[PDB]
């Protein structure tokens, strides 16, 4: 997509490696925020959004939590707590066209700047001067979407780059997207290290009498820490009895 009208694939109920991403020399950058790219393989997510678009190489620095500038202002604001990867690759050999690819566009005029993920496809003539817009332009008032017009002869910062932002989400609702990491057997009544669908921890995985309602999935103590879990393969309810410790 043009960056004013960015793509959003939403990812659920599937599994992937992320090294197949971060290993590849194709990626011009692999900027990460709130997560480390190698560590993604240890995790499961409620969902991911592959928010994705083309921008010119100059603009990639704007794609951060806590940043402002033309893309962040008018096209695609990241929240100032965005969690995930911004992956970019030079696409001058893909998106640029001789005579310019004008089918890649960006906004630079609006009544006010974007809020986080505030997608906006509006086309109305913008009031860049004292005159009313009249539904027509010439001067003082103008159409709000600039075009990049990408020519393959562009200088390296003016070249197009394909961007995928992996906007991860972890909610109270349990994970549905998984890393590549292989499962193991269950081990009750022993002190063990564990990863239940992205919940990392350590304790004694006792079985329980707790009546989880059919939608209820984690149980929590007063501390807002996981007291119980329902096993994501066998659906039995386990008390995570604390790890065995005391003073000496």
């Amino acid at each position, epitope marked *: 997509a043009s960056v004013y009208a960015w793509n959003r694939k939403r990812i659920s109920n599937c599994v992937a490696d992320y090294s197949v991403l971060y290993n590849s020399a194709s990626f011009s950058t692999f900027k990460c925020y709130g997560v480390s790219p190698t560590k993604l393989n240890d995790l499961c997510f409620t969902n991911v959004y592959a928010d994705s678009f083309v921008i010119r190489g100059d603009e990639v620095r704007q794609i951060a939590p806590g940043q402002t500038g033309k893309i962040a202002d008018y096209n695609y604001k990241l929240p100032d707590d965005f969690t995930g990867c911004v992956i970019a690759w030079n696409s001058n050999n893909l998106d640029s066209k001789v005579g310019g690819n004008y089918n890649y*566009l960006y906004r630079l005029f609006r009544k006010s700047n974007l809020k986080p993920f505030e997608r906006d496809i509006s086309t109305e003539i913008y009031q860049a001067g004292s005159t*009313p817009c009249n539904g027509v*332009e010439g001067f003082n008032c103008y*159409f709000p979407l600039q075009s990049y017009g990408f020519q393959p002869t562009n200088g390296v910062g003016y070249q197009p780059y394909r961007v995928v932002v992996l906007s991860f989400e972890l909610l109270h609702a349990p994970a549905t997207v998984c890393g590549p990491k292989k499962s193991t057997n269950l081990v009750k009544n022993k002190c063990v290290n564990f990863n239940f669908n992205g919940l990392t921890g350590t304790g004694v995985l006792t079985e329980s009498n707790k009546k989880f309602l059919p939608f209820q999935q984690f149980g929590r103590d007063i501390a807002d820490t996981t007291d119980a879990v329902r096993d994501p393969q066998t659906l039995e309810i386990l008390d995570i009895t604390p790890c065995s410790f005391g003073g000496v």
Partner: antibody
Amino acid sequence: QVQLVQSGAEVKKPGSSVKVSCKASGGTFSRYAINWVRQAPGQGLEWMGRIIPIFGIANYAQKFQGKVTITADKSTSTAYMELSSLRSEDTAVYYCARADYYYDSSGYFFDYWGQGTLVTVSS
Amino acid sequence: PGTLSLSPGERATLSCRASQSVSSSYLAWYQQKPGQTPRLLIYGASSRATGIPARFSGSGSGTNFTLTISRLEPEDFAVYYCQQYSSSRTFGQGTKVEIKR
């Protein structure tokens, strides 16, 4: 290209429409608007409408609202105008041109004019 | 249309009839051989990076934005239309230039 390939005599009767047609260079749908105008033969010229081929969205001056209907093929830059309230006294010349493209253009002015359409109407 | 007569080699200067409002830029002057397809002669106007570079100018008064044919050649003699920009795109009927006798 330059001379947009406007259809000719479009010979017609009142209480009707005609799909006037025209041609502009292949990629230009992505890089220019098409604008439309009327002229009585040997007499004054006035503006009539517009299309923005990025979306195919069109606009009209109030005299031509409902009387005119503009469309275009975004895949070829072929252009069209249904003269959607045609009359004998509407037997004027009609014109279109490549135009606009905002503060990304050098100055918004029209350049490739069409070869004209004397829509020839009588009762 | 209204008409002015001039000899070949004269310098023309004619008012935009649409200049009822001033506009923050002029657009262009379009020539026509009567009724036929118009032709762009002055362009990009209120600048001077304007028109077919052999002749012409548009900055000849800061409202009238005159058809300023720098030295009339025999093919410049025609009817003309005048157009201006400030949330605007409208045409005025210019003035015709004819060969004087």
